[PDB]
Design an enzyme around this catalytic site. Structure first.
Site, mmCIF file in Angstrom:
data_model
loop_
_atom_site.group_PDB
_atom_site.id
_atom_site.type_symbol
_atom_site.label_atom_id
_atom_site.label_comp_id
_atom_site.label_asym_id
_atom_site.label_seq_id
_atom_site.Cartn_x
_atom_site.Cartn_y
_atom_site.Cartn_z
ATOM 1 N N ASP A 258 -5.376 33.203 13.407
ATOM 2 C CA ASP A 258 -4.728 31.904 13.334
ATOM 3 C C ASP A 258 -4.677 31.234 11.960
ATOM 4 O O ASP A 258 -4.309 30.070 11.847
ATOM 5 C CB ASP A 258 -5.326 30.933 14.340
ATOM 6 C CG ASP A 258 -6.765 30.697 14.120
ATOM 7 O OD1 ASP A 258 -7.356 30.877 13.000
ATOM 8 O OD2 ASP A 258 -7.342 30.353 15.172
ATOM 9 N N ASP B 4 -5.934 28.346 19.602
ATOM 10 C CA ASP B 4 -7.199 28.915 19.164
ATOM 11 C C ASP B 4 -7.218 30.373 19.485
ATOM 12 O O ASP B 4 -7.080 30.698 20.663
ATOM 13 C CB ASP B 4 -8.336 28.306 19.959
ATOM 14 C CG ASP B 4 -8.723 26.907 19.481
ATOM 15 O OD1 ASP B 4 -8.217 26.437 18.410
ATOM 16 O OD2 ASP B 4 -9.554 26.260 20.189
ATOM 17 N N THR B 5 -7.438 31.236 18.491
ATOM 18 C CA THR B 5 -7.561 32.676 18.692
ATOM 19 C C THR B 5 -9.024 33.042 18.572
ATOM 20 O O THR B 5 -9.759 32.380 17.834
ATOM 21 C CB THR B 5 -6.819 33.503 17.622
ATOM 22 O OG1 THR B 5 -7.196 33.039 16.320
ATOM 23 C CG2 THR B 5 -5.367 33.285 17.712
ATOM 24 N N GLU C 260 -12.161 34.575 16.987
ATOM 25 C CA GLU C 260 -12.405 34.775 15.554
ATOM 26 C C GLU C 260 -12.987 36.149 15.208
ATOM 27 O O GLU C 260 -13.563 36.798 16.051
ATOM 28 C CB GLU C 260 -13.250 33.618 14.992
ATOM 29 C CG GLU C 260 -12.608 32.224 15.309
ATOM 30 C CD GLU C 260 -12.704 31.198 14.170
ATOM 31 O OE1 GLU C 260 -13.375 31.455 13.131
ATOM 32 O OE2 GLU C 260 -12.094 30.122 14.330
ATOM 33 N N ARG D 158 -6.188 22.934 4.778
ATOM 34 C CA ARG D 158 -5.213 23.916 5.303
ATOM 35 C C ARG D 158 -3.964 23.142 5.833
ATOM 36 O O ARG D 158 -4.125 22.113 6.510
ATOM 37 C CB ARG D 158 -5.853 24.702 6.469
ATOM 38 C CG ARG D 158 -7.106 25.432 6.001
ATOM 39 C CD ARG D 158 -7.714 26.227 7.135
ATOM 40 N NE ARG D 158 -8.305 25.353 8.168
ATOM 41 C CZ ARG D 158 -8.845 25.814 9.305
ATOM 42 N NH1 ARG D 158 -8.884 27.155 9.583
ATOM 43 N NH2 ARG D 158 -9.322 24.944 10.186
#
EC number: 3.1.31.1
Length: 136
Positions: A16, A35-36, A38, A82
């Site tokens: 992500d 949300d992926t 991690e 970011r």
């Protein structure tokens, strides 16, 4: 109304997170509303479907002819600097693609950055129904 601007891939970091050249500067982008699992977790490091979400985002962005970034109506940067955006590879939203494959959950939503929230939640509901990946 949201609009798309061009960007060029520098490097896919995670499922992500991506580094892109945007308006001539390297910048890290985090994908909005998803949300992926991690591969770079403070605590756990590498979680389940982490490498798969990561390879799926990377292939999608690396093999695209055109990348575009679309900011939402709220804050455009998080507290880590970011960019917060929806990323499109050849016209296909990467945020949605991930959720549709059961490789990402819809995140906790912070109004006003929730423009594509319903559309993403519909794809999530389909991946759950189909029991894909995360949902298996």
């Amino acid at each position: 109304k949201l609009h798309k601007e061009p960007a060029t891939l520098i490097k896919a970091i995670d499922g992500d997170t991506i580094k892109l050249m945007y308006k001539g500067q390297p910048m890290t982008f985090r994908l909005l509303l998803v949300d992926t699992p991690e591969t770079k977790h403070p605590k756990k490091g590498v979680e389940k479907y982490g490498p798969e979400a990561s390879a799926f985002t990377k292939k999608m962005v690396e093999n695209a002819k055109k990348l575009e970034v679309e900011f939402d109506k709220g804050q455009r940067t998080d507290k880590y600097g970011r960019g917060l955006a929806y990323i499109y590879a050849d016209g296909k939203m990467v945020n949605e693609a991930l959720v549709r494959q059961g490789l990402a959950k819809v995140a906790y939503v912070y109004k006003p950055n929730n423009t594509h929230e319903q559309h993403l939640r519909k794809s999530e509901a389909q991946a759950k129904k189909e029991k894909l990946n995360i949902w298996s």
